[PDB]
Design a protein around this ligand. Structure first.
Ligand SMILES: [Mg+2]
Ligand SMILES: [Mg+2]
Ligand SMILES: [Mg+2]
Ligand SMILES: [Mg+2]
Ligand SMILES: [Mg+2]
Ligand SMILES: [Mg+2]
Ligand SMILES: [Mg+2]
Ligand SMILES: [Mg+2]
Ligand SMILES: [Mg+2]
Ligand SMILES: [Mg+2]
Ligand SMILES: [Mg+2]
Ligand SMILES: [Mg+2]
Ligand SMILES: [Mg+2]
Ligand SMILES: [Mg+2]
Ligand SMILES: [Mg+2]
Ligand SMILES: [Mg+2]
Ligand SMILES: [Mg+2]
Ligand SMILES: [Mg+2]
Ligand SMILES: [Mg+2]
Ligand SMILES: [Mg+2]
Ligand SMILES: [Mg+2]
Ligand SMILES: [Mg+2]
Ligand SMILES: [Mg+2]
Ligand SMILES: [Mg+2]
Ligand SMILES: [Mg+2]
Ligand SMILES: [Mg+2]
Ligand SMILES: [Mg+2]
Ligand SMILES: [Mg+2]
Ligand SMILES: [Mg+2]
Ligand SMILES: [Mg+2]
Ligand SMILES: [Mg+2]
Ligand SMILES: [Mg+2]
Ligand SMILES: [Mg+2]
Ligand SMILES: [Mg+2]
Ligand SMILES: [Mg+2]
Ligand SMILES: [Mg+2]
Ligand SMILES: [Mg+2]
Ligand SMILES: [Mg+2]
Ligand SMILES: [Mg+2]
Ligand SMILES: [Mg+2]
Ligand SMILES: [Mg+2]
Ligand SMILES: [Mg+2]
Ligand SMILES: [Mg+2]
Lengths: 197, 386, 114
RNA sequence: CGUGAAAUUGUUGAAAGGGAAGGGCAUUUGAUCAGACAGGCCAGCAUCAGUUUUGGUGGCA
RNA sequence: ACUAAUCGAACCAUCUAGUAGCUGGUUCCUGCCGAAGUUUCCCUCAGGAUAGCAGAAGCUCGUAUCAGUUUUAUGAGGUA
RNA sequence: AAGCGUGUUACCUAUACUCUACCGUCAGGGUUGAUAUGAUGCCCUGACGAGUAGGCAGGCGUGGAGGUCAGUGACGAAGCCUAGACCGUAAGGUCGGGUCGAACGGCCUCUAGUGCAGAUCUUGGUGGUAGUAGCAAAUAUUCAAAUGAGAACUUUGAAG
RNA sequence: AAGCGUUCAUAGCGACAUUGCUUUUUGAUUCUUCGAUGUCGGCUCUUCCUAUCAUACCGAAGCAGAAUUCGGUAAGCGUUGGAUUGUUCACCCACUAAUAGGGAACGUGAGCUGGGUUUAGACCGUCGUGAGACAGGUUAGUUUUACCCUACUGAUGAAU
RNA sequence: AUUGCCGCGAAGCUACCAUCCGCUGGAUUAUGGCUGAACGCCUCUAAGUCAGAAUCCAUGCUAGAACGCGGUGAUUUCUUUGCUCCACACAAUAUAGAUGGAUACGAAUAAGGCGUCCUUGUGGCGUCGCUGAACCAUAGCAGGCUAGCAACGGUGCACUUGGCGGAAAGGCCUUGGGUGCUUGCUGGCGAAUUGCAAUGUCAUUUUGCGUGGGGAUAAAUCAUUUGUAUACGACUUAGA
């Protein structure tokens, strides 16, 4: 119900999350995906690397520049999954795709915005325990994506500042909860409690 | 059905498209891997290919049947006057790729690099960098505000240099401006190097030494439109062939119903950027001295310039690099000399070279004298009057 | 009408690669411009403010000749003449309907506006 | 040289144009246009009839 | 081979709109009904006649002699 | 599992089914002492509607003919143009504006050389291709002057 | 898996049987093309497949070494020069690491060539009374057009 | 003498007929192994894992999306007194679709968060989840005028102090003062007629135009010219 919904791609199955995103864009929702390098695919890494090599060999024989485009980045791999669940050749499909941004890591300004998940598509909630899976960043680097290291480096710098921010927020919510704790037993507090608040 | 007889493909698919280069100055696509321990130094140099000469040297290659005996080898001379450092650029690592964050320039720029930013220099008011030259007014307070930015950020530091084309015998008057990655030392030390070297001249012997494997980066000689027989080296068709024989007979099967990208077809030949590697330096010649072309075994007070000047180029009055063999490009052409991207240890590298004799006969013909004194000695007195 | 014309540098003035120098066409046009400026002077029009407001070239009836082809064939060899006409000129220097509830809002805006 | 069509063309004006264009159903937008005051236009609610759909509850075997 | 760009029988005109079981085309709207490629015969097999299928005109009458169906009863058959 | 096997519901939507309206077709009927004058008219009731080849029926349009409207018209007939309007399911019909200049319609009948997208259809006209392919055999032209609106091409002189 | 393999079915083979795959054989069919998709071979050039000749790394052997044979991943990279023949096919000489097999309208004729087939001239043999016949031999015999669109190779370029 | 012929012939082009040069990292296949159950043993495999092919992906090389992006330089007056930035005044232009708030740890899930304590751990104890059904916010002529009480808070506006943030920072945390409002509590007045409903107009891009307050005072193309280029364009040069 937010004007922009930011989805943290970690722990998400790629086809189940992108089918969720496809319906949201066609229903008019702006969706931003971050940490697409942390997406997941069911099946072993070698099995998924074999499927990308079957994709890699598909090219227009008389001119490889006009053929299928094999995008290596996890955000663009995610985008290719989305296309196929969106009628991208129509004007409505191009308007839906204009409502989506995907990213490796969390660039600004999404670093300081709340991220959500899709339990309808989470790997830990959909896969059976003991089933092998694959991380998109590992798959992408195996097929020529060149920025796993700098994404991992810049994510570490972001996580340090984010952890520092949460400590200064843990302290503030601790004080706020203490002020609410002493506010109880008053005249207003007992009326709110009898009214469910 | 199959080809009925196997042959290797004509041409190399990795040098495609065989189109004209986007600029005459070929761009450096890769710099040597940076080792932070070493002192801060340039990784490339800019020079103008003057021409070729011939040397004699003793081969030091054990096992070779010509070991310890003289060989004659072709060399290429590139006029390399000391380039001027005029600026610095910092590059921040980004998931989208390397990206420049800011650039700093020297307070004063030479007219030969101010010409570069112009198409009509004579018509111009010469207004370039006038307001940037006012940033140095009080103490250059805006300049250290940007150098501190490069030091804090910018995991890569490059330096802006320009050639001293006013010293080379060219007819251009306008320098070539390039970026050279600055290897060694911390990010601060690279910026420290750049600040100390603003408005200064960096010589070629500070970058390169003798016997060093270096890379040549230049746009090759142009040949205009060319047919498939010379552009790709395909077989000439027989004499009986109607409607052309300098062609390719079959440019595809019926299916796929298209000409494929891998079929040899006519078009532009030459004027392509090329990066040739492993070119040993034979002489880091100094310009501020006679006996440029002298060796230990010659002791003749002659310069590197042949007897009558380099053909289509001119003399040499500056520092130069003698490099073994041929390098891409032609005479008068800007070339990038780049340090090796790997340490080669195959006894061709690591083979110290001592020149015995450098050919200084005229390349304008079948020149049979090295110096004017030698010509006057052999011929004697002529009718030409003093 | 420019398919398979040569390219020239002088088309940069107009943003095209294909431009030519139709000397015969230019002479006919500038003859008519000189005639129109004569009419403007005769009419009393001020020449420093004149500009080509309308110029139109139409297809005239064609002039027929023959050309002789291989294997005893005859094809047309035909001119494409022009009708030309041009004009020079001097450069020259709501009941609204509202419903009852719309008018009431405008009344309610005015009696509290300052 | 009566009238002076179409194919095809010029000028002007309007519109749209990521490897055709054209069309069918429906609507938005822009343009343009006909009629009616002695009911014309678009609607809201209540009580009914016809055809349905979705609930709540009651009594029996 | 050649016999006026014409030759295994020139050119011109007429008979001549020569015949063609063969190819192509066969021009307004709406409404109702609505097929056949199967029988026999033919120097028959790219055709026709004949019977069948279809339309139209109806006529004599007015719920029946009836029926791409079953049951009951009684036959027949020589395939699984 | 968004795979396989099986089971239970909910849901989606055909020009199919049900109900209603409207069109047409068919069938069965009503309707004359003013049917409160259309009896091939008005009205009631029920059912039905795919369609090539093909058959039949009812209509639209064109040239000319008999009759009629004592029809239209130089105060504009016919024609043509018109992302202007209306009527008809349709064939089509009617009107407004522009252009034009001399004849032309409605209705009842008669008559036919009577309706076109095709036939490598006929005749004529026009396109894209397209300012394109090309205007390259025969050795070769140049300078000045004259004439002229205009000279590579005319004339004369000089040269080759 | 009966046997061969000195003994030992399966190192390598493998009878009698039996299950398949492929569409580079040839049959079989006649669906497309008879207002025509240029019918052999070669040359040239690119690409694809693997049922791998060589090369890389391996596993097995009746692998002591050397050399071989069988098998795996594997089509990345190569797979030739000639005598004869129009030949595809074939055979031989020789080099080589190897001289593996195929597809792409039996790839490729507005790319060529035209030796062959396959028009019209002519000869021979057989057959036919004859005109003539012969997937029998022999010799001579016109190989057209791109300037359009796409594709491809190169070259400009408005707008930010 | 259609380049008359012959010998030599610079320059240019060109030759496995000449010379130079043609990079090294990771992940893997087959296979061989480690540990190790199923199956108390065994086992390269089931979970994990080592090495390893002319393989693959990178390094490197070629091109650079003409609708991918970045950094930097200069940006036109006495040249229809032009250009740019800021503010407010009026017009047009449209909206892939505002209608209180996109409300920020990280990791795991056969585990975690929060709080507390210690001997600072892979610790003890308590508690929570079982969905955001939350939290914050939210009363007033679309939100008026005004009197107080309590408190010294909340919050808006510009202004100011300091710091942090380069992945696309363009935002976050702040000090201090001024100026409003406050629904934390108690009052007084006003609202009607939009007539029984008509989104009943409150938003944000862009383009101009005018007004008044700052700021700067160029290039590019053609034409000429070069030949490191070239069919033409283009490219590379030069000219007050
Ligand atoms: Mg799809
Ligand atoms: Mg790549
Ligand atoms: Mg082969
Ligand atoms: Mg590179
Ligand atoms: Mg020929
Ligand atoms: Mg030379
Ligand atoms: Mg063209
Ligand atoms: Mg041409
Ligand atoms: Mg052209
Ligand atoms: Mg001709
Ligand atoms: Mg006329
Ligand atoms: Mg017309
Ligand atoms: Mg449409
Ligand atoms: Mg409309
Ligand atoms: Mg005769
Ligand atoms: Mg006839
Ligand atoms: Mg006839
Ligand atoms: Mg029927
Ligand atoms: Mg019948
Ligand atoms: Mg029987
Ligand atoms: Mg499905
Ligand atoms: Mg019908
Ligand atoms: Mg008639
Ligand atoms: Mg009239
Ligand atoms: Mg008249
Ligand atoms: Mg007729
Ligand atoms: Mg017609
Ligand atoms: Mg031409
Ligand atoms: Mg001639
Ligand atoms: Mg059949
Ligand atoms: Mg054909
Ligand atoms: Mg195999
Ligand atoms: Mg073929
Ligand atoms: Mg062909
Ligand atoms: Mg041909
Ligand atoms: Mg022949
Ligand atoms: Mg063409
Ligand atoms: Mg051609
Ligand atoms: Mg002669
Ligand atoms: Mg050699
Ligand atoms: Mg073990
Ligand atoms: Mg670009
Ligand atoms: Mg309030």
């Amino acid at each position: 119900v937010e004007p922009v919904v930011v989805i943290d791609g970690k722990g998400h199955l790629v086809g189940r999350l992108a089918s969720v995103v496809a319906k949201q864009l066609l229903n008019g929702q702006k969706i931003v995906v971050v940490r697409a390098e942390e997406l997941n695919i069911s099946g072993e890494f070698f099995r998924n690397k074999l499927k990308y090599h079957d994709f890699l060999r598909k090219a227009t024989a008389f001119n490889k520049t006009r053929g299928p485009f094999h995008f290596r980045a996890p955000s663009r791999i995610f985008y290719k999954a989305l296309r196929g669940m969106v009628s991208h050749k129509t004007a409505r499909g191009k308007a839906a795709l204009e409502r989506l941004k995907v990213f490796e890591g969390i660039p600004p300004p999404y670093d300081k915005k709340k991220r959500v998940v899709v339990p309808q598509a989470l790997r830990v909630l959909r896969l059976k325990p003991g089933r092998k899976y694959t991380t998109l960043g590992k798959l992408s680097t195996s097929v020529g994506w060149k920025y796993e290291d700098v994404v991992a480096k810049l994510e570490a710098k972001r996580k340090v500042s984010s952890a520092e921010y949460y400590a200064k927020k843990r302290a503030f919510t601790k004080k706020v909860a203490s002020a609410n704790a002493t506010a109880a037993e008053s005249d207003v507090a007992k009326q709110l409690a009898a009214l469910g608040y | 059905s199959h080809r009925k007889y196997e042959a290797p493909r004509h041409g190399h698919l990795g040098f495609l498209p065989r189109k004209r280069a986007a600029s005459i100055r070929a761009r450096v696509k890769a710099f040597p891997k940076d080792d932070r321990s070493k002192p801060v130094a340039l990784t490339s140099f800019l020079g103008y290919k003057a021409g070729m000469t011939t040397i004699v040297r003793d081969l030091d290659r054990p096992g070779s049947k010509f070991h310890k005996r003289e060989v004659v080898e072709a060399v290429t001379v590139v006029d390399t006057p000391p380039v001027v450092v005029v600026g610095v650029v910092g590059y921040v690592e980004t998931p989208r790729g390397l990206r420049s964050l800011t650039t700093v320039w020297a307070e004063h720029l030479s007219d030969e690099v101010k010409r570069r930013f112009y198409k009509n220099w004579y018509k111009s008011k010469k207004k370039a960098f006038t307001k940037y030259s006012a940033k140095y007014a009080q103490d250059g307070a805006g300049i250290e505000r940007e150098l501190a930015r490069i030091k804090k950020y910018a995991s890569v530091v490059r330096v802006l240099v320009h050639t001293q084309i006013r010293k080379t015998p060219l007819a251009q008057k306008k320098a070539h401006l390039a970026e050279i990655q600055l290897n060694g030392g911390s990010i601060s030390e690279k910026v420290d190097w750049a600040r100390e070297h603003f408005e200064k001249t960096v010589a070629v012997d500070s970058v390169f030494e003798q016997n060093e494997m270096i890379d040549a980066i230049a746009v090759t000689k142009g040949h205009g439109f060319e047919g498939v027989t010379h552009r790709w080296g395909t077989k000439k068709l027989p004499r009986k062939t109607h409607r052309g024989l300098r062609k390719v007979a079959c440019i595809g099967a019926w299916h796929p119903a298209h000409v494929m990208w891998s079929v040899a077809r006519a078009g532009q030949r030459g004027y392509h950027s090329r990066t040739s590697i492993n070119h040993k330096i034979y002489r880091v010649g100094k310009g501020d001295d006679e006996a440029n072309g002298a060796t230990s075994f010659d002791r003749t007070k002659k310069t590197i310039t042949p007897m009558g000047g380099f053909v289509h180029y001119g003399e040499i009055k500056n520092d130069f690099i003698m490099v073994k063999g041929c390098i891409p490009g032609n005479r008068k052409r800007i070339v990038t000399l780049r340090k090796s991207l790997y340490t080669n240890t195959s006894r061709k590298a690591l083979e110290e070279v001592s020149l015995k004799w450098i050919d200084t006969a005229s390349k304008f013909g079948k020149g049979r004298f090295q110096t004017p004194a030698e010509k006057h000695a052999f011929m004697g007195t002529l009718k030409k009057d003093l | 009408f420019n398919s398979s014309i040569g390219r020239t540098a002088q088309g940069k003035e107009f943003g095209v690669t294909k431009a030519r120098w139709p000397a015969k066409s230019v002479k006919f046009v500038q003859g008519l411009l000189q005639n129109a400026a004569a009419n403007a002077e005769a009419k009393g029009l001020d020449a420093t403010k004149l500009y080509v407001s309308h110029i139109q070239v139409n297809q005239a009836p064609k002039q027929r000749r023959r050309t002789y082809r291989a294997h005893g064939r005859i094809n047309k060899y035909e001119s494409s003449p022009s009708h030309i006409e041009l004009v020079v000129t001097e450069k020259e220097e709501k009941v609204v309907r509202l419903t009852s509830r719309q008018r009431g809002r405008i009344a309610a805006q005015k009696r509290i506006a300052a």
